């Protein structure tokens, strides 16, 4: 599933930091992560905001993300031929 992150904070650009240190930016308050990219990471994510002067806010309190695995089917049976 797509991983979606957002902030209510206002700024000129946003810095998003992945649990393993990967560092990307967006022009808006909403970021999405494609399951096939290097950012599809579970764990603690943080954000900082860049204003027009190029000054960067203290990082946010991390938000944990949990990416769950997909279980097996536990293939079901029946009770044999039924009269």
């Amino acid at each position: 599933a797509d991983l979606v992150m957002s902030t209510s904070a206002v700024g000129n650009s946003y810095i998003w930091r992945a649990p393993n240190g990967a560092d990307t930016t967006t022009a808006s308050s909403t970021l999405t992560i494609v399951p096939t990219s290097s950012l599809y990471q579970s764990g603690n994510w943080t954000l900082s905001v860049v204003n027009a002067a190029g000054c960067v806010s203290p990082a946010s309190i991390a938000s944990a993300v949990e990416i769950n695995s997909i279980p097996s089917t536990a293939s079901a049976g029946n009770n044999g031929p039924v009269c």
Partner: protein
């Protein structure tokens, strides 16, 4: 010959099981530890894979032996008696 039978894996704590219809685990048969097989008419084989924490063990092949068909019993030719 002609009836149903069970297969039976040993028990490994925490393991998932998977049975496959052929070697090379190309086609999955079931996910049960003790699945059944319907309509066995001749000898066949099944392949068991056991997986723990995502790591499979060596594929375990088994054979279900099918007893051979029985002969018709033998009775005498049409006979005839008087009252």
């Amino acid at each position: 010959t002609g009836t149903d039978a069970s297969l039976s894996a040993g028990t490994v704590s925490g393991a998932s099981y998977a049975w496959y219809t052929d070697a090379g685990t190309s086609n999955q048969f079931s996910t049960l530890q003790n699945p059944t097989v319907n309509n066995l008419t001749n000898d066949s084989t099944f392949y068991l894979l056991v997986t723990v924490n995502g790591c499979p063990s060596a594929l375990d092949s088994t054979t279900v032996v099918v007893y051979p068909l029985t002969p018709s019993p033998s009775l005498p030719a049409d006979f005839a008696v008087c009252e």
